[PDB]
Design a protein around this ligand. Structure first.
Ligand SMILES: *[C@@H]1O[C@H](CO[C@H]2O[C@@H](C)[C@@H](O)[C@@H](O)[C@@H]2O)[C@@H](O[C@@H]2O[C@H](CO)[C@@H](O)[C@H](O)[C@H]2NC(C)=O)[C@H](O)[C@H]1NC(C)=O
Ligand code: NAG
Lengths: 99, 274, 9
């Protein structure tokens, strides 16, 4: 089965400039399992990102979380880039702090 | 309340790139606690929760040996299925398995299960009676016949009623501070404009544990579960969860809609508005 | 404690 991934980007705590927080990129409902996930700060790859919570649902689609500690500022931007066979090109989803 | 111990296993072939990738991830309830990944340079079963520091070196050695054995059996399974389905060796294929047991508040077994899938489709599964298997196609029927002659269900039933339940009880005891805790949700509502004098109201629930939660939107005492949009409950990176649910309403009438949050950590459900 | 021996398909 070929299922396109849903990509969700969100912080642990409501964002407040200057205060430590956690940024998450949850990639879900995909198949096959092969996939590439990267988190970016101002367009540059964030090193030491942690991958966790890998699982699958009743219909067998895959789920996995990418997360990292961060201290937001008014103008730093963050995003999650994902590459999967179901898509022609990599998909980049930005963190929307006003969602 | 009830608790569960689950193991998610995945084997993925990759022709022309070496051996299949093999992974095992274990969970107590909705908390990841152990993991094995064949693609690390020194594949070993590793702790994923702080309380697992309470197990000795022998525990890790034994789990690691089991994982390496499992890795080899699934490697063989991938070849066998190419035969059952008359497929070529040039493409990538996936085998997935979910195994687990669940106990009640008193620690006694409520149910057990083990289900397999090939390329994202049901293959074979253990029936509720823990005595027979049910096959999704003719290939799985061959497997069913093999397992009946080998007594596979009896061996798995013994694991469920003994080992699985006993260790789940131990994990709940050792990690009580983490697993039996309750973190109350903190909520808020965001507002967004849209085309045609309408507005999007989004209700957020943050920092809670366990994961089970209910979020609803009401209008004059009636739930709008229909025209409501939402995301599946998701992990937030520190052992807690979050979720949001939204509804579209007429501009200037936002005050007539209320979000309701029900959770184990809320003696009285939360009611809030924009 | 993980399952110990997954029977071959
Ligand atoms: C979680 O349970 C502990 C008791 O169990 C702790 O010690 C070992 C037996 C082992 O299971 C270990 O993993 C676990 O952390 C509770 O602590 C006890 O609390 C009572 C309160 O009356 C004290 O009298 C005991 O001395 C104390 N035992 C210990 C740890 O020395 C602990 O309270 C509980 N966690 C929570 C929710 O607070
Ligand atoms: C298996 O597939 C090949 C073509 O890929 C075909 O020649 C052969 O007859 C098939 N055998 C079966 C069991 O259908």
């Amino acid at each position: 089965i070929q299922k396109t991934p849903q990509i969700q980007v969100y912080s642990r705590h409501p964002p407040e400039n200057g205060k430590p927080n956690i940024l998450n990129c949850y990639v879900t409902q995909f198949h096959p399992p092969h996939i590439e996930i990267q988190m970016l700060k101002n367009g540059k790859k964030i090193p030491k990102v942690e991958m966790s919570d890998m699982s699958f649902s009743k219909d067998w689609s895959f789920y996995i979380l990418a997360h990292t500690e961060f201290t937001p500022t008014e103008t730093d931007t963050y995003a999650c880039r994902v590459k999967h066979d179901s898509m022609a090109e990599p998909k980049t989803v930005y963190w929307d702090r006003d969602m | 309340g009830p608790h569960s111990l689950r193991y998610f296993v995945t084997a993925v072939s990759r022709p022309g790139l070496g051996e299949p990738r093999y992974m095992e991830v274990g969970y107590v309830d909705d908390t990841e606690f152990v993991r094995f990944d064949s693609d690390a340079e020194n594949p070993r079963y590793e702790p994923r929760a702080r309380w697992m520091e309470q197990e000795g070196p022998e525990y890790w050695e034994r789990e690691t040996q089991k994982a390496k054995g499992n890795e080899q059996s699934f490697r063989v399974d991938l070849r066998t299925l190419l035969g059952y389905y008359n497929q070529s060796k040039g493409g990538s294929h996936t085998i997935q398995v979910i195994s687990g047991c669940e106990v009640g508040s008193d620690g006694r077994l409520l149910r057990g299960y083990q289900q397999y899938a090939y390329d994202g489709c049901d293959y074979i599964a253990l029936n509720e009676d823990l005595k027979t298997w049910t096959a999704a196609d003719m290939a799985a029927l061959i497997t069913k016949h093999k397992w009946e002659q080998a007594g596979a269900a009896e061996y798995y039933r013994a694991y469920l009623e003994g080992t699985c339940v006993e260790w789940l009880r131990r994990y709940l005891k050792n990690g009580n501070a983490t697993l039996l805790r309750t973190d109350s949700p903190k909520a808020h509502v965001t507002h967004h404009s849209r085309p045609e004098d309408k507005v999007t109201l989004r209700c957020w629930a943050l920092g809670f544990y366990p994961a089970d939660i209910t979020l609803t939107w009401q209008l004059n005492g009636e739930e709008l579960i229909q025209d409501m949009e939402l995301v599946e409950t998701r992990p937030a990176g520190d052992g807690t969860f979050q979720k949001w649910a939204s509804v579209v309403v007429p501009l200037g009438k936002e005050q007539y809609y209320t979000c309701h949050v029900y959770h184990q950590g809320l003696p009285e459900p939360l009611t809030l508005r924009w | 404690f993980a399952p110990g021996n997954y029977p071959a398909l």
